[PDB]
């Protein structure tokens, strides 16, 4: 689901 | 804290292409998703697609695929809709709409523009 | 595609009284994502309720979203004037994003 990516990229630049 | 203003009415010929600008300031541009969403005169609002600035990733409602580019530039925090091969239907507001926060992203759009009104006409 | 209906399109309603919209989705909405939006006329939309239920900071609390699956509502606690406006309904489970035909909220005199 393209609306998840941004979820995942915030997830990920926070560690 | 996060705005968004787009470029003004646009009127076009019908076969012509209109690009819209919508440029953000406030919160984070890369990493937030911006969607384009229009309405004709009297009628409902429809998802057209969005950019991820960040990773370039586009995705687009198949209606348009074939017609639609949007693109991003993170050097002036402005994203753009161009549609294509235009027909009178496509009168319309265009919207631009970026995602809320909690920030951790809600997918939803919390961020509206004032709307662009593009008529297509001879 | 999922096809989003608001039945009835349109509720005539007074001041004061409770209104319970309805969005029916053709198959199981992904993750409950599912956003509720206002708009008046001449106006941008406005983010309600987001992931069917969630409401964000700045909203009124009269509105409240429920449902999951194919069957989601906005409740309306309390009809103020400014409430009778156009409510859409969005569905987000799936990259291809779609509303609803929007509901109609108008005085009954």
């Known amino acids: 689901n393209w609306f998840d990516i941004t979820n995942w990229l915030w997830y990920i630049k926070k560690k | 804290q996060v705005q968004l203003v787009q470029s003004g009415a646009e009127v076009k010929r019908p076969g012509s292409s209109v690009t819209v600008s919508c440029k953000a300031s406030?919160?984070?541009?890369?990493?937030?998703?911006l969607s384009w969403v229009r309405q004709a005169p009297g009628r409902g609002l429809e998802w057209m697609g969005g950019?991820?600035?960040?990773?370039?990733?586009?995705n687009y409602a198949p209606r348009f695929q074939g017609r639609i580019t949007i693109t991003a530039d993170r050097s002036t925090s402005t994203a753009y809709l161009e549609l294509n091969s235009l027909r009178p239907e496509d009168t319309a507001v265009y919207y631009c709409?970026?995602?809320?926060?909690?920030?951790?992203?809600?997918?939803?759009?919390?961020?509206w523009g004032q709307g662009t009104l593009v008529t297509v006409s001879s | 595609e999922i096809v989003l209906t608001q039945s009835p399109g349109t509720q005539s309603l007074s001041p004061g009284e409770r209104a319970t919209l309805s969005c029916r989705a053709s198959?199981?909405?992904?993750?409950?994502?599912l956003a509720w939006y206002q708009q008046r006329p001449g106006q941008a939309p406005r983010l309600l309720i987001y992931?069917?239920?969630s409401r964000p900071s700045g909203v009124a609390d009269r509105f409240s979203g429920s449902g999951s699956g194919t069957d989601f509502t906005l409740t309306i606690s309390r009809l103020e004037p400014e409430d009778f406006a156009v409510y859409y309904c969005?569905?987000?489970?799936?990259?291809?994003?779609?509303f609803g035909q929007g509901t109609k909220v108008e005085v009954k005199r």
């Open positions: 950019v991820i600035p960040l990773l370039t990733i586009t």
């Open positions: 709409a970026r995602e809320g926060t909690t920030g951790k992203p809600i997918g939803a759009f919390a961020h």
């Open positions: 969005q569905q987000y489970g799936q990259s291809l994003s779609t």
């Open positions: 406030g919160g984070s541009f890369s990493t937030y998703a």
């Open positions: 198959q199981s909405v992904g993750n409950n994502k």
């Open positions: 992931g069917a239920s």
